[PDB]
Every structure is written in structure tokens, then in C-alpha cells.
């Protein structure tokens, strides 16, 4: 019945500070410790720090001093992890977790923290075209800062063979993503194919056609 | 030939608790132990298995440095074959120890106005610590015959307790920083020597 | 001096009903202070086994841990469709807390060669901004693959952002996407772009290319 | 180093009582603080345990639904609530220390006595007792009747007469009111030498009455 | 549910003698890991909360005299006082903290034993102010007797009274080691108006024969 709820995802400019909150419930607070670990996109788990609410003692990782400060509010059953002077390397999802001594038995939802120099910008989708068994086509979105982005193709009708990739961040650039689909070559000129892209943060839907 | 960063552990701005005693690995350097013995800044400088005079002109393959803070009354327990709440549960030393122990007063650094309750120590364990073993478990201890699945209750308490460390304390209850050097020679080249 | 944790193998592939055994090693002895965690993509880690030997509440009996000092092994009696995820080992014997590199587990499949395609940039971006050539692999079981991006007879490794999907839920095949980025004035330097791919299911390497 | 509990109070059936146990001169968090209740003229009955520095409770089955142990907001105290009070809940409640903690010696707190009874607060009626057919040393005293709630305190000659005085424990009458009698043996030579008065005091009702006892001719 | 049963329920020991209080638990109180009996002894004088004197069934709490001593093992435990004094006259409980919940004994009330003392009986008629009130009550007094065992029965006009007398005994005096008892007979003033002679027949061991102190309604 142990359950930990973390704060919402936040976007910060480089050099600023972030404060991730974590409210624990379903168990006796102050009887267990609480820890923080972050996971960079496509990387392992890196321990941030650990604090015991019984005595308020805080211990941080090797090189996070002057940057991280972890506090606990016993009355509200809430632990706050704060990281300041944030840079682009620190962008990751931070996990709150009930910390026993030699183990961690309950983990929180996590809170994504994105710190990049650019600001929100609508995506620019560019159509892919096949030429010269089955064939492959698709679309390509680029120059969008917020990570959430969706594709639906023929309004949900085209669902077999479609492969939407994970987004990758270009060098000093906004995220980039490509969606593809495999379709028989004999049906290429008969049926129309359109990719419907909806970027909720920019609130801009874009449809683009594909053809040789 | 670079010297050993011993002022890196003895002048380490922060120290650790006994239940989580920090361990440093020192190698590829020359260490002058005669400077530390005659420093007159350490209240206790006891060595086991090694003569401190002959220790300087000697070589080892790897030397460990364990650092933590205890009460003055508990400095006696940081020694081979000791009994107490520290030696049994916090930090144990082997019977065949070949390293020294160095302690000194640290009231100005580890005790402030209103007390300094940030240093902890282990109070309960189901068994004694093995030599050089560490245990940081905050599992509630089963003091009675009734089990507890990690929930506080009667006969089931938090195993960690904070020191007082008030400025106007007695000497035996005063904060004392202690560093234990371990002299280990295994199947490797000797790399920590003296002049 | 901290303590580093290593795991083996880096990536394993088995099927339902098989007996999978993973290993974990530490720099210094940690006695019984190792824990195993299971993380699935998009979700938080779960504690599988604490103290390297005892089972945690809510974990099936097929999971079993063992070891002491610096060598530990985690074994599964028989693999299940819900067991395919990434596994980690951590030490809880000292500070700072450190984890292992990780071990991904995917379902086994007959070796399948990747269908490779290549796409040119459309004229719509060339007015706004130079776009990249997109060479995609599709439906290959072993994720191990090297996307070689070439121009003329040389091999340029300046930029190749590889984006890979997770193992497909239906056919259990991966899909890779790589984008060689150059500028429009650079796009006229050679005007012939060849995509080269090496894979385990290919008898000989396969090159896809388009001109102008 | 000692534990000071709250003041004694009285309540009607079905009400709620909240007893505060303050720990002075340090904290008892190393082994916690337990609650033990003692029915008047009965044994010791454990109730539960609590951690003052952190929180969290452990309760017995017979009280699980009624007892509510609360951690302090500050001032290093401990609280305890009891709802749906029955007549059997009338007892003295102590906050005990664990026998095996040497930080503070085994010492409990002054027990806050609570009394649950339908009878309302009432003052005592005091009647003198006359010395006569007696002695070898004549004995006299006073009678207090129909008083609630306990305790009551009686003295003789405003505390001057302290030897040979026997104050008896009260008894609850069927009407729900206590009543006792306190006596004293004085030499039969001093009946006309020194007068005697009994000073009974009922702190709950704040009633102080002095009764002049006069010996009878016979 | 570990029941603690002490023997005997009440004990009487002379001054300077030794007092032995037995205590038997429902099951063994020693643990396999540490061979310590999780048994404790408590003293509770009638005025204030109890005071701990023995824990782990042998180790004494600091600040108590050497007279008290913890002994026994397993499920049999005995508390022993070398020389009984007047100050350590109280009820003693044995309590275990081996299992949850911890349980105490029923108690052993310890009293000083002295020679037999006869009680000097007295009788007090109801006061005139009480007679002016709604009801009246008669007071029979027993004073300075060691054996608390004493039956008193009110007799009103040679008729045995029962169900209306409430006995009451004070605590043992520290100086002379004696008790005192007061039987209170309550009835309506109209019922008190009808009958003439009111007496309290007192029976005690130190009394060679039942001593009867009586009075008539029309007296002073
Ligand atoms: C710590 O610093 C002091 C001066 O700040 C120096 O005298 C002392 O030797 C240092 N400790 C070492 C080097 O172990």
C-alpha cells in the first residue's frame, strides 16, 4: 500500500534551479529513509542523494555538493530534492523512492526535468518519398523543442507496419523524429497516404502528403 | 615522486558517521608518517602490529584510510578485540590487525550552538559485525520475540540513534574525529613508502 | 575512492520457459548488501531481490539471488513474457550508492535480415533549412547493427544519429533510423549518397543509394 | 529527565479524554513511551506504545478502536485519546518508560486520574462526630457525604494536629457520589483544653468548609 | 496473551525478616539468541506511580538498596528482600517484556507482620445536623489492630442488619503497623425514628469475645 507521488515535469533554462517534491503515504514516515536517483535518456541509474527524516541527516553523491540540497518536512510527509545551477547534462527524469538502509523497496512515479537553451517551437514536418515485394514511406518532424509529439497516419486506420521511432535531440538543436510505414508496392499509386502530426505543446496540428 | 594526500582525509571538511564509515584508497605516493606521529594534534595515536618508528622507512602495497566520528568514551573501542556498541555494531577491527588508529578532539568543528545531531551510530544488530564490515541498514530491530515487517512498534525500534554533541559537553561525550589506517600487503608491488 | 558495479552479459536474448542467469560484480567486498531491480521502458524500477539472497514481497518464486563478497548471480527458473525488461544490481554496503551498467532482455527469434531503404530530402525544406538523408532498417531481430554512412568511396562518421525502436510487440523485430546531416551547399559537393548496413542475417553487406 | 502528565479531569459517558504526557530534560525516543492503565484497586493493564520523535503507534486489541495516540506538534509531549467512554474506563493512566533504557532512569509520570460517571459535579455535606462513650484516649472525627468527584482532602486544626489521625478511603454510593469519614484520637484530658475543627476541601467544586466538632455532655 | 501469576496474593512478613515473592509466567521468558530473561519487577506504593527496581530478572536498577534482588530463570522468578523495612511496604508486580503485548502480574500486597493487637471499638450516633437533613448514618469505628480480618455486623433492636453497611479500611500505619476500620450504616431518618437501640457487634482474633458498643436514640 506504500505509494509515493512526485511533482509535475518542469522545463528550466540553463543555470536556473529546480525543486522536485515527493509526498509519501501508505506507510509510517520518518521510520524509513528517502532517496533520489536520476536516469538520463538511454543511460543507467545515477544516485543523487539520501536523507533520513528521523534525524534530518543528508548525504549526497561524490560531486553534487553546492548543487543538490535534499530537505524533508515530517509534518507533511514530503521530501524535497533541489538541484541548482542546472546545465544541459543534468536533464533527466528524477525518481523518488523509499530508502531502507541496504535496499530500496518502493519507487515513485518520477519527474522529468528538461533543461535546454532553446524555447518552445512548433515542429516542421518534411515528407518522405519512395521510388524504384513491399515499399517504405513516411514522414519526418524537426525543429520542435517540447518532446511530446504524436503521429496517427490515416486517422488511426493505418495501423499495420507503422513504426514511430523515439525522438533524438540534434547537436545544439531541437528534438527530431521520423515516422515510417511499409506498404505493398502495387498499392502505392492507388491509395493515398497522409501523416497527421499533433504537437500538443505548440497546439499545432499538421498534415502532410507523401508521393513519388 | 608525488606525496600522499594525507591532508585530504585528516583535513576533510566533513566526516562520516560510524555506521557509514568512509574508506579511502591511498597508493602511488610517498607518505611521511613521522610527521603525523609528532604532530601533537592527535589525542590518541595507537598502532598495532607495526612499530611507528620503523613504520616510516617501510613500504606497503595498498593502505586504506577509514574516517568517522565517535564519542570520547568510545575511542577505546576502536581497537582489535574490543567489546561495546561501536566495535560490535558500528566498526569492527580484525584480531590480526596491522594498522594504526588516530583520534583527535573536534568540538569546535562537530558541535555548534544548540547541538549537532547529524552524526549517527548503530544501536542494534542481530549479530556482531565482522572485521572491516559496514552496515547502513535502517531496518527496524526485532528486540523481542514478535516479528515486525519494517513497522515501528513495541520491541521494534529504529536502529540508528543520534549523538548529542553539545558544546558544553563532557570529554567522554565530546566529538572526536578518528581515522584508522590499514596497512595491507597483498600480491602486488609496494607503492606507499616513506623517505 | 568509490566502488564500481559491473554486470554480465551486457545484453541477453532468450525465450519463454528458458533458464536465464545474470551476474554482478563489485570493486570491493560488500557482503550481503546487493539488490536487483527490474525496469521496463517508460516505468520505474521495481525491487526484485534484496540483500542479494532474500525475496521481496510481490515477486514470484522463480526469481532467485545468490553470492557473497564481490560475486553475485541472479537466476530465473523459467522466463515469462512479463520478465522481458532491463535488470540492474546495486550495492547498499557503502557511500555513494552505485548501480551496475544494466542488462537488457528480449525475446528470442529466428535471425531476420533488415529491409533497408533510403530517402532523399524534399524540396520544401531546402528553402527553409537543409535536411538530411534518412536510411532506415526494418524487421531485423538482432539489434546489433552498424549503419555506415558514405559519400563517394570514403566513409564519413561526422554525424549519424541512430534512433532505434523497442522490440516489436507482434513480430519481435527492431527498426533503426539514422540521419546523416549536412548542409544544402554541402549537399552539392558530391550529390551521390550511399547507405551501407552490416548485420548478422546478411551473407554480405548491403548498400542502398540514390543520386542527386 | 522526568515525565509530567496533564491535570486530572472528569467526563460523562460517551465523551472523549485527551491525556498529555510531557517529557522534560530530554527525550525517550530511544525506547519510546508506553501507556499503562490501572483500575482503582486492580492490577496494571497495558494499553499501547508510541514513538515521540518520529510517530507511529502500537495498540492492544481491546483498545484498538477507542485509543488514539498522538505525537506532539512541539514541546516534546505525547498525547492519548479515548472515545466512547464507559463506566469501566474510570482509572488512572500512566505513561511508562522502558525498563532497559539507561539514558533516563526507570521513572513514570504522575498519573492523570479520569473518572467516568453519570453523576454531575457536587459539593460535600459535612457533619460533625461527637465524642462520648469512649476512651481509656477519646476518639472524634468528621463525616463527609455525597461528594463527586474524588479526590477530597481533610485536615485537622488547620494542619496542627497530625498524630493519631486516620483518614479513610471514600466509597462510591449507589447515587454515584463518594463519602468517607476521617477521625483522630486525642487524650480525654484535652477535650475541654483544646477545641477541634476538621477542614475538608473539594478542589473540583472549590468548596472549603470548616466544621467545629463539640463534645457531648454524656 | 502471556499471563503473569504471582504467589501469594498477599504476604505478611515481620520487620527485619526476608520476604519472598514468587512469579510464574505463561511461557519461557528467555530468548535463544541472548540468554536473558525479559522479566522485570516493579514496586508501587499506594500514593504514586510504580517504581522499577529489577529488570532482566537479576540486574538491579541503580538507586535501590541491596535488599531487593532478582532471581530465577525460564518461567519461575522470585523477588527477595533481605530485611523488610517500614518504607518498602507496597504492592509488587512482575512484568515481562518478552512478547507483545507486555503483561503484568495480578499483584502481591506486602504488609508488615506484628503481634496480635485488639481493636478499641467506638460508636458515633448520627449528628443533629444530619438528622435535620434527609437521611442519617451511624458510624462504628475499629482502631489500631494488626489482623485486618475482622467482621462487624450492625444490630438494630436485636435484629441483624445486612446489605446496608459499607465497610472501609485504611492503609497500614507506618509507625505502629496497625489498621483501622469504619462500618457505615445508612438508612432513612424515619426508619431511624422507629427503632431505639443501635449497636455494632465486632468480632476479632485479639478480642476474646465479641465486643458490642451500643447506644439508644434518646441519648447525647
Ligand atoms: C591541515 O591543514 C593545516 C593548516 O591548515 C596543516 O598544518 C596540517 O598539516 C594539515 N593536515 C595534514 C596535512 O595532514
Amino acid at each position: 500500500q506504500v505509494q509515493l507521488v512526485q511533482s509535475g515535469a518542469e522545463v528550466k533554462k540553463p543555470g536556473s534551479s529546480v525543486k522536485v517534491s515527493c509526498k509519501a503515504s501508505g506507510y509510517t514516515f520518518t521510520s524509513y529513509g528517502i532517496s533520489w536517483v536520476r536516469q538520463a535518456p538511454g543511460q543507467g541509474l545515477e544516485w543523487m542523494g539520501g536523507i533520513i527524516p528521523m534525524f534530518g541527516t543528508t548525504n549526497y553523491a561524490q560531486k553534487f555538493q553546492g548543487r543538490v540540497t535534499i530537505t524533508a518536512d515530517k509534518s507533511t510527509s514530503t521530501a524535497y530534492m533541489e538541484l541548482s545551477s542546472l546545465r544541459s547534462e543534468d536533464t533527466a527524469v528524477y525518481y523518488c523512492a523509499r530508502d531502507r538502509g541496504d535496499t530500496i523497496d518502493y519507487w515513485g512515479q518520477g519527474t522529468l526535468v528538461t533543461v535546454s537553451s532553446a524555447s518552445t517551437k512548433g515542429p516542421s514536418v518534411f515528407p518522405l518519398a519512395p521510388s524504384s515485394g513491399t515499399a517504405a514511406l513516411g514522414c519526418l518532424v524537426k525543429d520542435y523543442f517540447p518532446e511530446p509529439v504524436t503521429v496517427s497516419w490515416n486517422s488511426g486506420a493505418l495501423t499495420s507496419g507503422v513504426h514511430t521511432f523515439p525522438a533524438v535531440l540534434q547537436s545544439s538543436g531541437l528534438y527530431s523524429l521520423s515516422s515510417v510505414v511499409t506498404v505493398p508496392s502495387s498499392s502505392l499509386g492507388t491509395q493515398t497516404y497522409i501523416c497527421n502530426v499533433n504537437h500538443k505543446p505548440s497546439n499545432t496540428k499538421v498534415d502532410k502528403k507523401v508521393e513519388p | 615522486t608525488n606525496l600522499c594526500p594525507f591532508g585530504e582525509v585528516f583535513n576533510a571538511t566533513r566526516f562520516a558517521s560510524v555506521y557509514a564509515w568512509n574508506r579511502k584508497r591511498i597508493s602511488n605516493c610517498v607518505a611521511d608518517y613521522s610527521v603525523l606521529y609528532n604532530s601533537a594534534s592527535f589525542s590518541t595515536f595507537k598502532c598495532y602490529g607495526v612499530s611507528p618508528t620503523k613504520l616510516n622507512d617501510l613500504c606497503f602495497t595498498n593502505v586504506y584510510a577509514d574516517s568517522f566520528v565517535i564519542r570520547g568514551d568510545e575511542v577505546r573501542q576502536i581497537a582489535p578485540g574490543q567489546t561495546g556498541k561501536i566495535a560490535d555494531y558500528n566498526y569492527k577491527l580484525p584480531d590480526d590487525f596491522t594498522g594504526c588508529v588516530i583520534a583527535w578532539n573536534s568540538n569546535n568543528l562537530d558541535s555548534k550552538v544548540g547541538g549537532n545531531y547529524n552524526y549517527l551510530y548503530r544501536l542494534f544488530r542481530k549479530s556482531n559485525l565482522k572485521p572491516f564490515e559496514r552496515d547502513i541498514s535502517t531496518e527496524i530491530y526485532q528486540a523481542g520475540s514478535t516479528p515486525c515487517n519494517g513497522v515501528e512498534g513495541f520491541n521494534c525500534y529504529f536502529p540508528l540513534q543520534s549523538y548529542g554533541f553539545q558544546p558544553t559537553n563532557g570529554v567522554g561525550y565530546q566529538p572526536y574525529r578518528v581515522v584508522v589506517l590499514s596497512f595491507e600487503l597483498l600480491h602486488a608491488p609496494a607503492t606507499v613508502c616513506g623517505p | 575512492s568509490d566502488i564500481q558495479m559491473t554486470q554480465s552479459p551486457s545484453s541477453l536474448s532468450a525465450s519463454v520457459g528458458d533458464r536465464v542467469t545474470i551476474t554482478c560484480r563489485a570493486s570491493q567486498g560488500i557482503s550481503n548488501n546487493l539488490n536487483w531491480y527490474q525496469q521496463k521502458p517508460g516505468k520505474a524500477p521495481k525491487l526484485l531481490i534484496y540483500a542479494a539472497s532474500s525475496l521481496e514481497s510481490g515477486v514470484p518464486s522463480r526469481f532467485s539471488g545468490s553470492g557473497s563478497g564481490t560475486d553475485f548471480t541472479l537466476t530465473i527458473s523459467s522466463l515469462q513474457p512479463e520478465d522481458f525488461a532491463t535488470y540492474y544490481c546495486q550495492q547498499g554496503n557503502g557511500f555513494p550508492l552505485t548501480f551496475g551498467p544494466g542488462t537488457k532482455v528480449d525475446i528470442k527469434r529466428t535471425v531476420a535480415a533488415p529491409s533497408v531503404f533510403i530517402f532523399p530530402p524534399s524540396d520544401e525544406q531546402l528553402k527553409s533549412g537543409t535536411a538530411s538523408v534518412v536510411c532506415l532498417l526494418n524487421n531485423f531481430y538482432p539489434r546489433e547493427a552498424k549503419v555506415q554512412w558514405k559519400v563517394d568511396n570514403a566513409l564519413q562518421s561526422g554525424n549519424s544519429q541512430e534512433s532505434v525502436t523497442e522490440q516489436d510487440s507482434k513480430d519481435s523485430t527492431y527498426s533503426l533510423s539514422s540521419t546523416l546531416t549536412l548542409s544544402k551547399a554541402d549537399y552539392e559537393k558530391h550529390k551521390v549518397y550511399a547507405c551501407e548496413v552490416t548485420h548478422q542475417g546478411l551473407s554480405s553487406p548491403v548498400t542502398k543509394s540514390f543520386n542527386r
Side-chain angles (χ1 to χ4, degrees), chain A, chain B, chain C:
Chain A
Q1 190 39 242
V2 191
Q3 198 156 350
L4 294 73
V5 168
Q6 307 192 208
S7 53
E10 304 181 22
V11 183
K12 297 304 175 182
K13 305 177 183 180
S16 56
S17 183
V18 77
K19 312 200 174 186
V20 175
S21 68
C22 176
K23 184 181 184 303
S25 63
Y27 75 114
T28 303
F29 207 91
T30 318
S31 61
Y32 279 98
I34 190 80
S35 274
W36 294 88
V37 62
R38 69 176 180 187
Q39 189 176 26
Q43 296 179 13
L45 306 173
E46 187 184 32
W47 178 71
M48 294 297 299
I51 174 185
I52 297 178
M54 190 84 179
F55 315 98
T57 67
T58 69
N59 301 275
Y60 307 143
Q62 187 178 9
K63 202 47 202 172
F64 284 90
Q65 313 150 359
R67 285 244 310 271
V68 74
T69 69
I70 316 183
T71 65
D73 188 299
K74 321 171 188 177
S75 56
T76 63
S77 300
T78 315
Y80 307 84
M81 170 264 171
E82 186 267 352
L83 194 53
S84 64
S85 65
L86 287 164
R87 54 182 182 177
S88 295
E89 288 80 321
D90 292 325
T91 187
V93 47
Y94 296 78
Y95 291 77
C96 177
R98 168 173 123 179
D99 190 24
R100 202 166 150 280
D102 50 354
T103 189
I104 300 178
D105 53 357
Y106 287 94
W107 291 67
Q109 53 191 22
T111 295
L112 169 64
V113 182
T114 57
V115 176
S116 180
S117 306
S119 192
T120 61
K121 174 61 177 299
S124 183
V125 6
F126 301 136
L128 277 63
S131 184
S132 292
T134 52
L137 59 94
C139 292
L140 174 148
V141 291
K142 205 175 72 69
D143 297 3
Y144 63 98
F145 182 88
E147 174 75 357
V149 56
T150 187
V151 189
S152 64
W153 277 115
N154 284 6
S155 303
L158 180 61
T159 182
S160 69
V162 294
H163 284 158
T164 302
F165 282 83
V168 185
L169 185 136
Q170 298 170 159
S171 62
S172 174
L174 297 69
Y175 271 101
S176 178
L177 180 52
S178 59
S179 173
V180 308
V181 49
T182 68
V183 156
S185 301
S186 57
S187 63
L188 195 51
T190 300
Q191 164 76 324
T192 72
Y193 301 119
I194 299 177
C195 59
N196 309 8
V197 184
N198 303 82
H199 188 57
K200 168 65 181 178
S202 295
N203 197 31
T204 55
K205 65 167 302 179
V206 176
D207 297 356
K208 180 60 68 61
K209 286 73 51 190
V210 287
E211 59 176 356
Chain B
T1 70
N2 43 339
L3 49 80
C4 295
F6 270 164
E8 190 74 9
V9 59
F10 290 141
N11 291 12
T13 168
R14 92 192 69 90
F15 271 69
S17 303
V18 210
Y19 85 107
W21 46 278
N22 191 311
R23 193 172 189 90
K24 269 89 172 185
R25 233 173 219 57
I26 287 298
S27 54
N28 291 328
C29 59
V30 46
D32 195 357
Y33 305 96
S34 301
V35 174
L36 306 180
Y37 196 95
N38 313 340
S39 72
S41 179
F42 308 124
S43 302
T44 304
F45 198 119
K46 299 183 298 187
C47 289
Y48 306 88
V50 172
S51 176
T53 65
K54 322 299 298 301
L55 172 56
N56 212 25
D57 50 7
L58 218 53
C59 292
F60 293 92
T61 71
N62 225 16
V63 45
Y64 311 114
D66 312 334
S67 58
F68 48 90
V69 182
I70 49 183
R71 271 164 38 191
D73 282 329
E74 295 160 343
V75 185
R76 315 149 66 178
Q77 305 185 36
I78 310 300
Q82 293 283 9
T83 309
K85 282 73 194 171
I86 311 288
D88 298 0
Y89 299 153
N90 274 312
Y91 177 74
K92 188 51 179 290
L93 292 179
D95 304 358
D96 57 337
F97 197 23
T98 330
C100 301
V101 180
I102 300 161
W104 69 88
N105 185 285
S106 63
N107 201 23
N108 47 336
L109 307 178
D110 298 318
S111 71
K112 243 307 186 64
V113 156
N116 182 14
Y117 312 94
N118 286 332
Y119 294 92
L120 314 181
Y121 70 93
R122 175 76 40 163
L123 186 52
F124 303 109
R125 253 188 69 102
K126 309 173 66 173
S127 180
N128 291 333
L129 279 188
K130 291 174 182 175
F132 283 115
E133 193 181 5
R134 189 192 290 98
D135 191 359
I136 63 176
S137 175
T138 72
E139 169 192 37
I140 47 92
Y141 178 66
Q142 178 179 320
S145 63
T146 56
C148 311
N149 51 2
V151 282
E152 289 201 60
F154 180 69
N155 278 335
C156 274
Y157 324 95
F158 203 56
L160 271 62
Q161 171 67 13
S162 174
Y163 288 113
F165 289 160
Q166 293 280 355
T168 60
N169 263 4
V171 174
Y173 292 74
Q174 222 166 332
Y176 266 57
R177 288 180 173 185
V178 45
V179 178
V180 180
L181 308 185
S182 306
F183 290 131
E184 185 190 53
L185 59 102
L186 55 99
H187 285 163
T191 193
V192 278
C193 303
Chain C
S1 74
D2 307 4
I3 169 172
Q4 269 67 12
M5 310 299 303
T6 70
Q7 309 183 214
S8 181
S10 173
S11 54
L12 185 144
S13 293
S15 53
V16 176
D18 284 12
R19 173 177 178 176
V20 181
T21 68
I22 318 294
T23 60
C24 176
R25 287 207 77 262
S27 308
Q28 318 168 204
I30 56 178
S31 176
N32 293 333
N33 285 324
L34 187 98
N35 317 282
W36 291 94
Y37 301 84
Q38 159 187 290
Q39 184 183 18
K40 306 198 175 187
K43 300 191 302 183
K46 290 200 223 300
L47 179 62
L48 297 170
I49 277 173
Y50 65 107
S53 179
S54 46
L55 194 59
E56 160 73 346
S57 65
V59 182
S61 60
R62 69 218 187 201
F63 289 69
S64 299
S66 175
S68 60
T70 44
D71 307 334
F72 308 90
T73 63
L74 175 67
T75 71
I76 298 184
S77 181
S78 79
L79 217 49
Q80 299 288 329
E82 49 276 5
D83 296 340
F84 298 101
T86 313
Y87 300 150
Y88 296 85
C89 62
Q90 80 145 172
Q91 59 91 220
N93 191 45
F95 277 55
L97 294 168
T98 60
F99 302 85
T103 294
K104 199 200 188 84
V105 169
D106 48 355
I107 86 185
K108 210 171 187 179
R109 191 202 197 276
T110 60
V111 192
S115 300
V116 53
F117 303 86
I118 185 169
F119 285 90
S122 72
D123 299 353
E124 189 164 350
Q125 48 253 49
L126 291 175
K127 304 182 179 183
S128 63
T130 104
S132 305
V133 184
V134 182
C135 182
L136 66 97
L137 296 173
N138 203 331
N139 289 340
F140 57 98
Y141 157 67
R143 192 265 163 185
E144 301 84 326
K146 169 62 180 180
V147 43
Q148 176 59 248
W149 270 112
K150 290 192 290 187
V151 154
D152 201 21
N153 298 2
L155 340 169
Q156 293 180 348
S157 306
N159 35 230
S160 66
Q161 302 185 169
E162 312 184 27
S163 186
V164 183
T165 68
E166 307 163 16
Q167 187 167 75
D168 184 71
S169 55
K170 292 187 177 181
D171 55 23
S172 331
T173 61
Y174 295 83
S175 297
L176 203 155
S177 174
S178 181
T179 58
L180 179 158
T181 298
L182 290 175
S183 68
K184 179 199 171 305
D186 205 327
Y187 197 85
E188 306 295 327
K189 290 197 177 184
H190 192 282
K191 267 301 197 171
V192 174
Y193 316 91
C195 174
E196 155 80 325
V197 167
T198 312
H199 196 263
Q200 310 176 9
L202 293 177
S203 55
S204 196
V206 172
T207 297
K208 280 289 183 297
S209 59
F210 74 93
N211 294 18
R212 54 90 188 185

